[PDB]
Design an enzyme around this catalytic site. Structure first.
Site, PDB file in Angstrom:
ATOM      1  CB  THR A  74      -0.952  -0.372   1.236  1.00  0.00           C
ATOM      2  OG1 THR A  74      -1.838  -0.874   1.201  1.00  0.00           O
ATOM      3  CG2 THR A  74      -1.974   1.296   1.193  1.00  0.00           C
ATOM      4  NE  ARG A  97      -8.976   7.450   7.177  1.00  0.00           N
ATOM      5  CZ  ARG A  97      -8.775   6.125   7.089  1.00  0.00           C
ATOM      6  NH1 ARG A  97      -9.198   5.236   8.144  1.00  0.00           N
ATOM      7  NH2 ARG A  97      -7.878   5.553   6.180  1.00  0.00           N
ATOM      8  CG  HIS A 144      -7.087   3.614   1.062  1.00  0.00           C
ATOM      9  ND1 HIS A 144      -5.443   3.166   1.071  1.00  0.00           N
ATOM     10  CD2 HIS A 144      -7.527   3.017   2.738  1.00  0.00           C
ATOM     11  CE1 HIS A 144      -4.988   2.483   2.323  1.00  0.00           C
ATOM     12  NE2 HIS A 144      -6.403   2.501   3.261  1.00  0.00           N
ATOM     13  N   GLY A 192     -14.081  -4.276  -1.696  1.00  0.00           N
ATOM     14  CA  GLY A 192     -13.751  -3.812   0.226  1.00  0.00           C
ATOM     15  C   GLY A 192     -15.050  -4.233   1.628  1.00  0.00           C
ATOM     16  NE  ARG A 193     -16.282   2.534   2.627  1.00  0.00           N
ATOM     17  CZ  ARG A 193     -15.233   2.989   1.783  1.00  0.00           C
ATOM     18  NH1 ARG A 193     -14.682   2.364   0.705  1.00  0.00           N
ATOM     19  NH2 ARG A 193     -14.567   3.894   2.607  1.00  0.00           N
TER      20      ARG A 193
HETATM   21  C1  LIG Z   1     -12.536  -0.039   7.342  1.00  0.00           C
HETATM   22  C2  LIG Z   1     -11.541  -0.340   6.338  1.00  0.00           C
HETATM   23  C3  LIG Z   1     -10.390  -1.112   6.122  1.00  0.00           C
HETATM   24  C4  LIG Z   1      -9.436  -0.591   5.266  1.00  0.00           C
HETATM   25  N1  LIG Z   1      -8.605  -1.185   5.887  1.00  0.00           N
HETATM   26  C5  LIG Z   1      -7.242  -0.759   4.846  1.00  0.00           C
HETATM   27  C6  LIG Z   1      -5.387  -1.473   4.874  1.00  0.00           C
HETATM   28  O1  LIG Z   1      -5.387  -1.632   6.237  1.00  0.00           O
HETATM   29  N2  LIG Z   1      -4.735  -1.384   3.510  1.00  0.00           N
HETATM   30  C7  LIG Z   1      -4.946  -0.824   2.514  1.00  0.00           C
HETATM   31  O2  LIG Z   1      -4.130  -1.495   2.085  1.00  0.00           O
HETATM   32  N3  LIG Z   1      -6.506  -0.793   2.037  1.00  0.00           N
HETATM   33  C8  LIG Z   1      -7.126  -0.883   3.167  1.00  0.00           C
HETATM   34  N4  LIG Z   1      -8.748  -0.467   3.263  1.00  0.00           N
HETATM   35  C9  LIG Z   1      -8.574   0.279   1.531  1.00  0.00           C
HETATM   36  C10 LIG Z   1      -9.175  -1.277   0.752  1.00  0.00           C
HETATM   37  O3  LIG Z   1      -8.362  -1.769   0.649  1.00  0.00           O
HETATM   38  C11 LIG Z   1     -10.154  -0.537  -0.682  1.00  0.00           C
HETATM   39  O4  LIG Z   1      -9.242   0.650  -1.605  1.00  0.00           O
HETATM   40  C12 LIG Z   1     -11.237  -0.097  -0.322  1.00  0.00           C
HETATM   41  O5  LIG Z   1     -12.389   0.037   1.121  1.00  0.00           O
HETATM   42  C13 LIG Z   1     -12.105  -0.074  -1.771  1.00  0.00           C
HETATM   43  O6  LIG Z   1     -12.865  -0.073  -1.665  1.00  0.00           O
HETATM   44  P1  LIG Z   1     -14.564  -0.375  -1.550  1.00  0.00           P
HETATM   45  O7  LIG Z   1     -14.601  -0.789  -0.376  1.00  0.00           O
HETATM   46  O8  LIG Z   1     -15.439   1.230  -2.364  1.00  0.00           O
HETATM   47  O9  LIG Z   1     -14.964  -1.392  -2.470  1.00  0.00           O
HETATM   48  C14 LIG Z   1      -9.570   0.211   3.611  1.00  0.00           C
HETATM   49  C15 LIG Z   1     -11.146   0.254   3.969  1.00  0.00           C
HETATM   50  C16 LIG Z   1     -12.180  -0.011   4.835  1.00  0.00           C
HETATM   51  C17 LIG Z   1     -12.857   0.251   4.208  1.00  0.00           C
HETATM   52  O1  LIG Z   2      -6.488   1.346   5.306  1.00  0.00           O
HETATM   53  C1  LIG Z   2      -7.174   2.555   5.867  1.00  0.00           C
HETATM   54  O2  LIG Z   2      -8.301   3.361   5.102  1.00  0.00           O
HETATM   55  C2  LIG Z   2      -8.283   1.802   7.059  1.00  0.00           C
HETATM   56  O3  LIG Z   2      -9.377   2.633   7.823  1.00  0.00           O
HETATM   57  C3  LIG Z   2      -7.489   2.184   8.577  1.00  0.00           C
HETATM   58  C4  LIG Z   2      -7.196   2.712  10.275  1.00  0.00           C
HETATM   59  C5  LIG Z   2      -6.719   2.581  10.706  1.00  0.00           C
HETATM   60  C6  LIG Z   2      -5.560   1.248  10.981  1.00  0.00           C
HETATM   61  C7  LIG Z   2      -6.074   0.273   9.824  1.00  0.00           C
HETATM   62  C8  LIG Z   2      -6.046   0.634   8.740  1.00  0.00           C
END
Ligand SMILES: Cc1cc2nc3c(=O)[nH]c(=O)nc-3n(C[C@H](O)[C@H](O)[C@H](O)COP(=O)(O)O)c2cc1C
Ligand SMILES: O=C(O)C(=O)c1ccccc1
Ligand SMILES: Cc1cc2nc3c(=O)[nH]c(=O)nc-3n(C[C@H](O)[C@H](O)[C@H](O)COP(=O)(O)O)c2cc1C
Ligand SMILES: Cc1cc2nc3c(=O)[nH]c(=O)nc-3n(C[C@H](O)[C@H](O)[C@H](O)COP(=O)(O)O)c2cc1C
Ligand SMILES: Cc1cc2nc3c(=O)[nH]c(=O)nc-3n(C[C@H](O)[C@H](O)[C@H](O)COP(=O)(O)O)c2cc1C
Ligand SMILES: O=C(O)C(=O)c1ccccc1
Ligand SMILES: O=C(O)C(=O)c1ccccc1
Ligand SMILES: O=C(O)C(=O)c1ccccc1
Ligand SMILES: O=C(O)C(=O)c1ccccc1
Ligand SMILES: O=C(O)C(=O)c1ccccc1
Ligand SMILES: O=C(O)C(=O)c1ccccc1
Ligand SMILES: O=C(O)C(=O)c1ccccc1
Lengths: 334, 334, 334, 334
Positions: free
Chosen positions: B153, B162, B229, B283-284
């Protein structure tokens, strides 16, 4: 605790008398240009860069011979005692402490000499007076008091039609006055008179046409502010943010190019920078903070904006404001 | 019975504590980039082809040396025990059974070795740690556990602002921890260190600029994820879907090009493919399914997406994902 | 008394069971393509001509060897007994009396021979059956019964995902059947088999790609219908009205080019004509009229459309449909 | 006290019977063209000029051999006794006193000779009658009464389909009549007959196609009004404001080019001028003022528009209407 500029608007809305809130919030006519300032920013998306060195991210700029802590100054807003009893003094103190330039107004409710005494290397906004001699005497006062730039407002041959103020029957309370006193429309001749009267940088505020930007450089301006006066002057005037890229290209580094209108976050500052702005002005949000909590309110606003600007720059891969100016953008929808 | 991904969001909204739902749903700042991910997909229309042979329609792809059942992987999402007690294990089991890659997170709430033991040929998402040595030790752990790709990432020098989490005062419950532990910003030097430390494909997640995509190829990346992201990092960052076509053209087959952000149906997968994506991340919605019904919820989501992808591909005349990549698109309004 | 097609939708909504109204109204998936059919028409503005001779304004066209009273035909809509007990017979009688072609469906709820016996020189819509022999026998039945064109639907390798029908648990009542019976996906080979089996014009319905339109001409089609199947097939398919101009240019008079999807007034017919359509199909509104008032309802709808088409043509300076095809258009907003 | 044209609509809405308000407000069909007239103006932004000499700002123009106080005339609106008992006489008196041309209608509810006797150098709007001889006799009456231009309406081969009027069952009250009497569609031959019968300037109202504008010049017209008849004729006709720039370029000073449809402020007048209009017509707002307060209402409206036009021109740096025509514009969103 405020986590966005919008938190401050809600607080200001609570505290201010309705007619004063409307004086602050309103625009001219149908408020089409007021709304468009926001719409135009919301359509701009930044293309961030990744994996750049961020070990010394700095939000500082050099402008008009001074280091500023952020690419931002407080916009000229008349009659700040309308919003809080300390008025301009509260705002100028907070700006000084934050390292942000403060623009002292011709229509300040505290005298320009008192506000300049606060320190912080202030700028002075000029409205052209009834004749050349009085106008130049006002410029000389500002210079003698230690103001560092003359922000000549060029979009007010007269004040626009503010329908909220008309409908409210708004007038200044007896306790708010134009403290610099006991106007005629500006022309290019007026600009020349000012330029010849001071060695301070002259900054023309309210430029929207590309050829007016060029002419400003030819006239010896040190800067311009690309601006529709927060939608308070010509209703239907294009937002400054929509002219900014074209104007930056046209002046080709010949003067500083600032922009204002609807800047409401560090993200918006980044958008402005990415479109080529040297810096932004912020108007209404500074007054929201002043209304909400006086000097401390303005301090909190400037701290919040500083954190948002730093956050946005780093997330976009920019260790400096210069790097942010080299970012590309893409127009989107809604 | 769920007939769309939106059915799962409603179910997750029922069950989750508000602050946890907000952690999942939210974006940074004004959530402009979060909303734009959806807007951008909704503006894309596919030009389907008719009368093609569909006697062996397949949704399979080969990516990073593995057959995947769909052109999709589960996105890295930190702390999955927030959503269900089985957390990452439930999701990884469902992904394995569906033939979909699962991305194990650096900030997983179950250790990467436990999740990898589930099977299903997993990927590992890396956040750059305090120094090179520890970062590379984490990469080596993932490789030793049988992870098949390193998803580095690159859009998180630090976490975005946020505002939902700030307003809620959100923090991890004591029962959710970063199970891989008892961070510093990544640069191109970090990428090189990772590339030299493993023969696994390195995939840079969070690329939006065309020149960063080019540079990723030059740096020896096996893939990129074109991504903002999920609107959680720079507020005002362009959606990945809006940069995807340009980026695909620029890398000219030099690496796999994935996209994420707002994929909510098989139709959206088709749009992404038609714009040139090798595959998408989701993701979500995966977390909605996990919250709603644990492992079985995720199974049902993946079965639903599989049927939607098959349906969309065939209706568009595509017997393979390669054929879907050759579809044309047209931008529309709203 | 109805003064717009929207009056008929309100009446149909009154009378029909909810699940049947949803079968009629609905689209696939999120209904993005259904909504886009309307949005796309609403963005098109006509540039009318003035001061032309209107002493013999005629809405007639010649198409597939027959004079039609309007540049319009009734679209194929399956199972019309769902909407009124007289079903297809009521609609076909009204169409005959109005001089409008009626498209008899493969999935008609009254046998094609009974509907053809009504008269009015009908067309026949074909779905490809389990094998070539049965498909061609159905074509031969239609031809023997006096149908004048074969409208081969080419956008239904299988039926789309209609979420309203899934959520409602919709199924045909026991009293509604496919009266032509006691399917496999079509290909270009199927088209050739049909073309070789009949001297009737073969019209391919559901073409959206320009190269598919070209190929249709090369394959010996007498016409095409540029169509996304009323948003009922691929969710995210471009509206036909958005592809129409490009397709008309590409086929360069090699076949008739019809369009459908969201035609709801004579003004919309004019827009379609001005974009180059030979004629339109109208689906849902005909069924609204049938539901509201049976045969007499359909008569009133066709009389209303005839008056609207005449009105629009004359106001735009067009004494003939050919003249309407030479009108220019301009895209606007909302 | 009214501070915008919208204040007058609210007042008119109070006083008028619903069916009469609908006769005035309505358009044809779905009212798409009515709404688009407003949308189109709202998308236009002016690029104002600064620092110009404004010591003798004048809103006057010379048109059809007469000085007018503003670049505006009262549009032809039939049957003004519907709105106030003094009808056309009240409006013509206010227009005369304001120095604004008034267009006397063929379907005036007071005779053209009575209205002309008011003074103020009036224009006359012509609908083509059952034959040439009667049409030319009406032109001769207007000329004999001292009308200074013939505004030949060319977009009404017949009246459009006004669904509000149909739904309301609207008809003229017995006390409102066509006072010029005790129609057939116009053609270019009709235009020639009129041009040969009078030395007054002939102005063709309702031109939207560029080639019709060219042909109007070739036919000897002294002006055109670029207009969709306030959205009352072809539903789906492009707004005049969207064709204006192209038409101005095409006629290349060969005739005066006016525009109408949705002009609701001095700012809108400025937009029209900046797009190249010689002058505008204003319809509905004049009738709102008449309904609200008779002659004095119309006086107040014209005084308000005069102040708004002066304000907008000066804020945009224009000392004359010619200068306003040299302003540039930029299209924006919403
Ligand atoms: C709650 C949450 C936590 C996430 N944590 C990470 C993470 O630890 N590392 C990362 O590369 N992306 C993280 N993401 C981003 C997702 O990998 C992704 O890019 C994004 O959620 C994709 O969009 P979508 O949720 O609309 O499908 C996170 C997203 C959410 C909603
Ligand atoms: O990567 C992210 O978007 C994310 O929400 C998050 C926030 C804190 C710790 C790990 C992931
Ligand atoms: C209440 C108020 C008073 C203002 N007074 C002045 C002034 O005296 N001089 C001036 O040049 N601009 C004035 N402005 C315009 C601001 O300097 C600035 O251009 C505008 O407010 C920027 O937009 P923002 O408020 O959206 O940040 C004023 C604005 C407001 C809202
Ligand atoms: C209830 C319903 C049934 C339909 N059945 C068929 C069919 O059997 N064959 C076919 O080619 N098209 C079918 N269509 C599509 C229509 O022919 C047509 O393409 C679409 O309805 C046109 O759009 P409109 O309804 O917006 O006018 C059907 C449409 C509806 C609404
Ligand atoms: C109630 C009404 C009656 C009208 N009558 C006529 C007419 O008799 N002749 C004509 O040329 N235009 C007529 N018009 C059109 C106007 O002249 C003008 O084109 C239109 O109203 C301009 O738009 P506005 O009303 O938005 O300012 C009429 C308009 C309205 C609203
Ligand atoms: O400059 C302004 O916009 C403004 O609102 C104003 C109005 C009166 C006096 C001073 C400033
Ligand atoms: O509009 C005015 O007259 C006015 O008050 C003013 C204020 C500042 C500058 C110029 C005019
Ligand atoms: O923003 C942070 O400090 C943070 O928690 C973090 C998380 C992952 C990667 C980098 C920083
Ligand atoms: O063709 C159609 O759109 C349709 O709705 C349908 C569904 C089932 C059977 C026949 C037609
Ligand atoms: O989707 C189907 O199986 C279906 O019912 C059908 C209907 C018409 C043509 C092809 C398939
Ligand atoms: O011209 C018009 O738009 C109009 O409304 C009308 C209708 C009937 C008679 C006269 C004018
Ligand atoms: O539509 C009509 O018949 C009508 O009343 C009329 C009015 C003015 C001009 C032409 C026709």
């Amino acid at each position: 605790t405020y986590v966005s500029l919008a938190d401050l608007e809600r607080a200001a809305r609570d505290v201010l008398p309705g007619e004063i809130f409307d004086f602050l919030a309103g625009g001219s006519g149908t408020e089409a240009s007021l709304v468009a300032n926001r719409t135009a920013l919301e359509r701009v998306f930044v293309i961030p860069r990744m994996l750049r060195d961020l070990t010394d991210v700095t939000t500082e700029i050099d402008i008009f011979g001074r280091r500023a802590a952020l690419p931002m100054a407080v916009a000229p807003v008349a009659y700040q005692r309308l919003f809080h009893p300390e008025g301009e003094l509260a705002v100028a103190r907070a700006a000084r402490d934050a390292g942000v330039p403060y623009t002292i107004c011709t229509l300040s409710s505290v005298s320009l000499e008192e506000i300049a005494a606060v320190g912080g290397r202030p700028w002075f906004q000029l409205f052209w007076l009834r004749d050349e001699k009085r106008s130049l005497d006002l410029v000389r006062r500002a210079e003698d008091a230690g103001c560092e730039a003359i922000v000549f407002t060029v979009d007010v041959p007269w004040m626009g039609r503010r329908l909220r103020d008309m409908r409210n029957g708004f007038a200044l309370p007896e306790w708010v006055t134009a403290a610099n006193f006991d106007f005629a429309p500006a022309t290019w001749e007026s600009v020349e008179a000012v330029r010849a009267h001071t060695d301070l940088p002259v900054v023309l505020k309210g430029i929207l046409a590309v050829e007016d930007a060029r002419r400003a450089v030819d006239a010896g301006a040190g800067g311009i502010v690309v601006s529709n006066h927060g939608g308070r002057q010509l209703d239907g005037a294009v937002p400054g943010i929509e002219m900014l890229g074209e104007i930056v290209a046209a002046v080709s580094g010949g003067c500083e190019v600032l922009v204002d209108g609807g800047i409401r976050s560090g993200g918006d500052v980044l958008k402005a920078t990415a479109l080529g702005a040297s810096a932004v002005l912020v108007g209404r949000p500074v007054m929201w903070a002043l209304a909400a909590a006086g000097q401390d309110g303005v301090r909190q606003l400037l701290e919040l904006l500083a954190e948002e600007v730093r956050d946005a720059m780093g997330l976009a891969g920019c260790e400096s404001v210069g790097a942010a100016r080299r970012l590309n953008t893409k127009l989107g929808v809604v």
